[PDB]
Amino acid sequence: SDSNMLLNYVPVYVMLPLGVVNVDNVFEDPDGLKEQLLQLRAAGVDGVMVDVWWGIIELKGPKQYDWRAYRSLLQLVQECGLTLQAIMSFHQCGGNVGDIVNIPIPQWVLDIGESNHDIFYTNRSGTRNKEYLTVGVDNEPIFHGRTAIEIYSDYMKSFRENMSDFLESGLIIDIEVGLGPAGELRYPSYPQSQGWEFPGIGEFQCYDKYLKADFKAAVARAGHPEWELPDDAGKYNDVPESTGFFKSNGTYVTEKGKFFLTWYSNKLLNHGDQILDEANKAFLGCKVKLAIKVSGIHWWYKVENHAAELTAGYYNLNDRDGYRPIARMLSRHHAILNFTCLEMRDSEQPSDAKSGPQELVQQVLSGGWREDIRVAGENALPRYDATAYNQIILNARPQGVNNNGPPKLSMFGVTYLRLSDDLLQKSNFNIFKKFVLKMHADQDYCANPQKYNHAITPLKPSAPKIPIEVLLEATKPTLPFPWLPETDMKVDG
Numbered sequence: 001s002d003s004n005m006l007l008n009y010v011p012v013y014v015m016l017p018l019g020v021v022n023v024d025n026v027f028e029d030p031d032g033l034k035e036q037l038l039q040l041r042a043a044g045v046d047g048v049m050v051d052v053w054w055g056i057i058e059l060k061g062p063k064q065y066d067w068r069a070y071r072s073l074l075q076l077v078q079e080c081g082l083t084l085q086a087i088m089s090f091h092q093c094g095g096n097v098g099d100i101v102n103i104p105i106p107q108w109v110l111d112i113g114e115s116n117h118d119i120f121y122t123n124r125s126g127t128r129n130k131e132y133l134t135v136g137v138d139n140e141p142i143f144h145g146r147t148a149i150e151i152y153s154d155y156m157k158s159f160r161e162n163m164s165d166f167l168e169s170g171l172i173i174d175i176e177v178g179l180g181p182a183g184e185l186r187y188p189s190y191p192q193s194q195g196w197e198f199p200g201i202g203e204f205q206c207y208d209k210y211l212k213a214d215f216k217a218a219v220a221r222a223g224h225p226e227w228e229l230p231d232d233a234g235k236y237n238d239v240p241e242s243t244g245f246f247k248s249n250g251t252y253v254t255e256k257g258k259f260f261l262t263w264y265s266n267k268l269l270n271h272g273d274q275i276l277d278e279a280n281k282a283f284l285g286c287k288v289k290l291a292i293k294v295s296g297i298h299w300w301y302k303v304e305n306h307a308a309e310l311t312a313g314y315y316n317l318n319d320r321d322g323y324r325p326i327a328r329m330l331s332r333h334h335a336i337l338n339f340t341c342l343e344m345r346d347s348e349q350p351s352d353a354k355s356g357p358q359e360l361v362q363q364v365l366s367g368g369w370r371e372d373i374r375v376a377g378e379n380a381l382p383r384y385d386a387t388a389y390n391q392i393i394l395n396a397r398p399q400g401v402n403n404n405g406p407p408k409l410s411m412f413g414v415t416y417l418r419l420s421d422d423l424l425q426k427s428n429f430n431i432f433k434k435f436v437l438k439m440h441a442d443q444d445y446c447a448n449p450q451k452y453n454h455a456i457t458p459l460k461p462s463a464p465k466i467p468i469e470v471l472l473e474a475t476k477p478t479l480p481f482p483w484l485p486e487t488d489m490k491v492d493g
Contacts, residue, residue, distance in 0.1 A: 001403070001404075002443065004402065004403055004404055004405055005401065005441040005442055005443050006441065006443050006446060006451055006452050007402075007405055007406040007407075007452060007453060008397065008401045008402060008406065008407050008410065008441035008452075009439070009440045009441050009443055009446060009452040010396045010397065010410055010411055010412075010413060010414060010439045010440070010441075011046035011047070011412075011413045011414075011439070011449070011452075011454065012044075012045055012046055012413070012414055012415075012416065012435070012436050012439045012440070013045065013046060013047045013048060013049050013083075013085055013413060013414070013415040013416065014040055014045050014047075014048050014049070014415070014416045014418070014419050014423075015048070015049045015050070015378075015415060015416065015417050015418040015419060016033075016048050016049065016050045016418070016419055017033075017418065017419055017420060018051070018093065018094075018100075018101040018418075019093075019100070019101035019103075020033060020050065020073060021053070021056060021069045021070055021073060022056075022101075023055070023056060023101075023102065023103045025056050025057070025059070025066050025068075025069050026069055027069040027070075027072045027073050030072065030073075030076055033073075033076065034076060034079075034080065036419055036424060037076065037077065037080035037082060038080055039424055039429070040080075040082065040419070041080050041081045041082060043429065043432065043433045043436055044433065044436040044437065044440065044444070044445035045082065045436060045445075046082070046083060046413075046445070046449075047077075047082045047083030047084055047085060047173060048077060048082050048083075048084055048085070048419070049084070049085035049086075049087065049176075049415045050073065050084065050085070050086060050087065051087045051089040051093065051178075051183070052070060052086050052087060052088060052089055052159065053089045053093060053103045054088075054089060054090045054091075054105055054106060054155060055092065055093070055103045055104050055105045055106050056069075056103060057070070057155070058106050058151075058155060059106050059107065059108075061108050062108065062143070062144050062146065062151075063154060063158075065155070065158045065162070067158070067159070067162040067163070070163075071162070071163070074163065074166050074171060077171065078166065078169070078171050081447070083170070083171060083172070083173045084166075084171055084172050084173065085172075085173060085174050085176060085291075085415060086159075086172055086174075086175055086176070087176040087177075087178055087183055087293075088152070088155065088156055088159070088175060088176065088177050088178050088279075089178045089183055090105070090132065090133075090151075090152055090155075090178045090179075090183075091105070091131055091132045091178055091180065091181055091182060091183055092104050092105055092130065092131035092132070095130075095131065095193070096192050096193055097193075104130070105130070105131070105132070105133075108144075109133070109143065110130065112142065112143060112144075113128075113130065116142065118134070118136070118137075118208040118209040118210060119133055119134060119136075119137050119142070119208075120132075120133070120134060120208065121134045121181075121187060121188050121205040121206075121208060122134070122205065122206075122207040122208040123194070123203045123204070123205055123207060124203065124204070124207055124229070124230075124231070124233075126207065127194055129181075129188045129191060129194075129205070131181050131188060132180055132181050132188065133148045134208045134210060134211060135211070135267050135268070135270075135271045136208050136209075136210025136211040136214065137210060138271060138274060138275075139274075140210065149274055149275055149278060152177075152275055152278060153275075153278035153281070153282060156175070156177075156278060156279055156282035156283065157281075157282045159282075160282050160283055160286060167286045167287070167288065168286075168287075170287055170456060172286075172288050173288065173289065173449075173456065174288055174289040174290065174291045174336060175279060175283055175288050175289070175290055175291065176290075176291040176292065176293060176338060177275060177276060177279045177290060177291070177292055178293070179268075179271060179272050179275060179292055179293070180268075180271075182293075182295070183293050184293045184294065184295040185268055185271070185272050185292050185293065185294055185295070185313075185326070186268065186294075186295045186297075186312045186313050186314070187204070187205040187206070187264075187268070187311070187312055187313045188205055189202035189203055189204070189205055189308070189311035189312045189313070190202040190236065190308070190311075190312070191236075194236060195236055195237065196236040196237060197236075197237055198299065198353065199299035199300070199308070199350070199352065199353035199354075199355065200235075200236045200237035200238065200308075201233075201234065201236070201237075201238050201239065201240055201243070201246065201300065201307040201308050201311060202236060202307070202308050202311035202312060203233065203234075203235060203236050203311055204229070204230055204233060204264065204311050205311075206229060206264055206267075207229065211267070212229065214263075214267075215229060215260070215263055218259075218263050219259065222259055224255075224256070224259075227256050227259070227260075229260065230245050230251065230257075230260060232244030232245045232250075232251055233245035233246065233251075233311070234246075240300060240303060240305045240307040243307075245257065246305040246307040246310075247305075248304075248305075250305075252305060252310070261310060261315045262315065262472075264313055264315070265313050265314065265315035265322060266468060267313070268313045268314075268326075269325060269326065269329055269468070269471055270468070272292060272326070272329060272330075273329050273332075273333075273465075273466075276290060276292070276329075276330075276333040276335060276462070277333075277462055279333070280333055280334075280459065280460075280461060280462040283459050284459055284460075284461065285458045285459060286458065286459050287456040287457060287458055287459070288456070288459055289334070289335070289336055289374070289456070289459070290333055290334065290335040290336065290459070291335055291336035291337075291338045291376065292330065292335060292336075292337065292338065293338045293339075293340075294314075294323065294326060294337055294338070294339050294340075294364065295312060295314075295340065296339060296340035296341035296357065296360060296361075296364075296380055297309045297312045297314060297360075298341055298344065298349070298353075298355045298356055298357035298360050299349075299353045299354065299355050300353070300354050300355075301354065301355060301356035301357075301359065301360050302354040302355065302356045302359075303354045304317065304318055305317075306318075306322075309322065315475075316363075318477075319477055320475050320477070321363070321367060321474060321475050321476065321477055321478065322475070323363060323364045323367050324367035324370065324371060324474035324475065324478070325471045325472055325474040325475055326367075327367045327368045327370070327371040327373050327375075327474070328371050328466065328470075328471050328473075328474040329466065329471055330368075330371075330373050331371055331372065331373050331463075331466075332462050332463040332464065332465070332466055333462050333463075334459070334460060334462075334463075335373070335374075336373070336374040336375065336376050336412055336413075337364070337368045337373060337374070337375045337376070338375075338376045338377055338378065338415070339361065339364050339365065339375065339376070339377035339378070340377055340378045340379070340380045341357040341360060341361050341377075341379075341380045342361060342377045342378060342379055342380075342391065342392045342395045342396075342414060343379040343380065343381070343383050343388040343389070343391050343392050344357035344358065344361075344379075344380060344381075344391065345357070345358060345387070345391055346358050346359075357380075359480075361377075361395055362398075362480045362481070362483055363480055365377075365395065365398070365411065365481075366478070366480040366481045367474070367478070369409060369481060370478055371474065374412040375411055375412060376411055376412045376413040376414065376415065377395070377411060377414055377415070378414065378415045378416070378417055379392060379416060379417050380417075381417075382417060382418070382420075382422075384422065384423065384428040384431065384432070385431070386431055386490075386491050386492060389431065389432075389434070389435040389438075389491050390486070390487055390490050390491060392414055392435070392439075393435070393438050393439060393487045393489055393490070393491075394483070394484060394486065394487040395411065396410060396411045396414055396439060397409065397410050397411070397441075397487070397489070398481065398482075398483040398484060399481070399482065399483075399484060400484055400487065400488035400489070401441055401488055401489060406453065409481055412454075414439065416432075431491060434491035434492075435491055437491075438487075438489040438490070438491055441489065442489070
């Protein structure tokens with residue numbers, strides 16, 4: 001049925017090109033973007049996603065926001081009949097050798113970092129990563145009197161007020177709150193600029209003086225004041241078995257190791273919870289949803305130590321669910337878990353990476369649905385091919401279309417990385433249009449999301465705080481929902 005098929009519709013969003021608003025807070029090429037956006041509209045795309053870069057907007061100084069170029073961008077998106085996913089991007093864009101779009105965090109913050117190097121995530125060797133402020137300074141009032149969370153709160157409130165017309169009109173479907181490197185709720189455990197290459201295990205990023213002191217206090221309260229941060233976890237490009245920490249029977253399974261990993265992962269849960277508290281306050285009553293981005297760390301998923309997840313801050317083992325606690329935390333904020341790797345197949349990864357993107361996706365999505373939250377996601381890598389789109393479509397509706405009503409399982413949306421000239425080339429775009437159609441359960445584009453039961457209602461207050469022990473009850477392993485082996489709505493026949 002046309003209506004029952006419409007209840008199966010999963011909306012599709014497309015990420016805008018990086019730097020559409022440049023580092024100087026100039027919307028550089030509105031005419032070129034317009035032509036691209038109109039192609040997306042005709043293709044049936046529901047909306048677009050953009051980074052709203054902190055380093056662009058609050059560059060002049062504290063609380064000196066310039067929203068004008070982004071207003072022009074939003075105005076154009078509105079004219080082209082698309083909705084918008086706005087990322088509160090509190091992180092650096094680019095900065096690696098070769099990168100074209102380079103947007104550091106505000107220089108006034110970096111200036112404070114020159115005086116206080118511990119505002120940055122730091123590895124054991126002491127390298128400071130300037131892409132994001134450590135969770136350690138979330139509540140440290142060291143930024144001309146403000147804490148880091150107060151910076152993020154103030155920025156979101158200013159966005160809400162200055163974009164109030166677009167918000168009231170329904171242009172903005174969700175606010176994705178950036179929570180770390182690349183906007184993701186994680187530690188910067190695999191930096192290219194410090195030499196990491198896939199599939200290195202990465203490194204723990206808790207050596208800044210704030211986190212180190214917090215850990216030392218915690219171990220003292222646990223009756224082990226002498227415990228130190230890991231010293232046997234190796235380096236970025238190691239394999240797990242080469243390390244004391246991650247080898248079989250290694251430090252990760254000792255009382256000390258388990259305590260550290262709980263501590264380290266808990267910092268991210270509380271980071272996200274506290275910053276989402278501010279987002280709910282900032283956007284209270286607006287017809288938007290809140291979202292976060294969870295990183296997809298699929299390498300080493302297939303070995304018992306899950307080492308790359310662990311250094312990223314996801315304490316996920318075969319007998320400990322490190323993602324369902326995140327979902328549970330999101331529930332009190334009514335927030336969407338936006339994931340990734342939706343296009344990937346295990347067979348596409350090198351054997352030596354012990355990579356399990358399919359199973360990781362199944363775990364994370366299942367945990368969200370088990371916790372009765374919305375789950376969305378992205379492709380991890382650029383892909384233009386049918387294999388990729390069919391995998392996305394499978395993940396979007398893992399038990400297929402329900403011919404007789406809404407599907408029991410569906411993702412809330414998918415955001416495609418990324419708009420480019422390549423996407424819009426004739427063949428690539430033709431297959432993309434088939435992807436959109438199948439995401440839409442063979443229905444034409446539906447401008448009114450109420451028709452597919454995605455009405456936008458005013459954002460409510462956060463529900464009461466959930467104690468950490470209750471969050472961690474969600475570490476109890478659960479069986480995933482069953483997945484089909486292939487979608488029933490392939491782009492071809």
